Amino acid sequence: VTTEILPVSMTKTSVDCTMYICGDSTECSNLLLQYGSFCTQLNRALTGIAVEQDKNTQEVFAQVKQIYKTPPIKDFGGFNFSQILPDPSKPSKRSFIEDLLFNKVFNGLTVLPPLLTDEMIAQYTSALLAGTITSGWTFGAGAALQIPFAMQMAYRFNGIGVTQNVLYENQKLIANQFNSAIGKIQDSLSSTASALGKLQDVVNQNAQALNTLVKQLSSNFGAISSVLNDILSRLDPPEAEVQIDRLITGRLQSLQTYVTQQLIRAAEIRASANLAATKMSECVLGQSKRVDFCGKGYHLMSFPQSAPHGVVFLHV
């Protein structure tokens, strides 16, 4: 049993163009309108990112129509899924491995909230386990059909070229090998080893970008001062013109650099959130024949778990 971490979405933002460049300056509002429409572009780009984040979370998770449920008699021919199936005694619907994963990781700035809350994402990923266990791969191509679990696993062996008399003559050995490998995942994630490295660089690169956009509000750019209002109460209005025109032309380039480098960074999340949409369809909802796509070895099955702005697979 291995582990595979992918990113899915990132932080939705939106920055108002007028208040960032000159908040509370009614003559700078007349100085900005000499530049046409450089502010309705930047709001239209930062809106196109923000909707695009709420489409990535939809196609990774929301792929079943129903919401299946595990039966109250959890007797699966020798296996033990109590680490990944949810238990209601916790204050959330969230399972045990996902609680180990939720611990390892203004001048115009507003952050929108997500659309699917973390207790809705955690109900999709409880439907995908509850169909994979009790119904095989039959719920990907129609309606779910029940099957015993040790008869499901018998002809997932029959795909990789091992005849089905091997599992029924070695059922209790595999169950002890399968239950042991889950526990070493729960050790090596709850230990001091920090495995969530890919999800952490999404979050850090969104803070280095906003620690710089605010830092540019203290640079004079060749003017007499960085404070906007103190230039106004120290100059004549026909000579306060050519001092604010170094700040407006300066502060446009700091918005223009921010929005572009957010657009290139947002494009490599779609390259990652379309790969997770494929591994959700081909690894989870069926057995895969592609070599080293779902794991490292011959492939049997997989189990999704959630994470902050990401997803985690467990390729058996």
Partner: protein, 122 residues
């Protein structure tokens, strides 16, 4: 964000003013002419008169929604708002918690299977 009084020397604090944003939820103009207005996170105490006061005031994590009625239904989402809130026009505009899908359960057992009998070409 904090500064001493120069004359009487009491330490006092600074925090900025409101500064939210406006949104106008609307159905098609070839269906109605009634809108529901959402403000960006201003806690409904700091607010055109029907869209400024009156009834239908509702507090979301997305903001302060004025002009739609909170119900106890759960429907397929029509217009997104945020934090699992969707609004639609069914005659006035209602707001609710969006649903994920139909509840279902599978009769699992250690000795039963469900073979299909017919098919469908789609």
């Amino acid at each position: 964000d904090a500064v001493r009084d120069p004359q009487t020397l009491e330490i006092l604090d600074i925090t900025p003013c409101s500064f939210g944003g406006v949104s106008v939820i609307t159905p098609g103009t070839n269906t109605s002419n009634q809108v529901a207005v959402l403000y960006q996170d201003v806690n409904c105490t700091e607010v055109w008169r029907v869209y400024s006061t009156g009834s239908n005031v509702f507090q979301t994590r997305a903001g302060c929604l004025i002009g739609a009625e909170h119900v106890n239904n759960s429907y397929e989402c029509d217009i997104p708002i945020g934090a699992g809130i969707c609004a639609s026009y069914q005659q006035s505009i209602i707001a609710y918690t969006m649903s994920l899908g139909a509840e279902n359960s599978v009769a699992y057992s250690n000795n039963s299977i469900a073979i299909p009998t017919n098919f469908t070409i789609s």
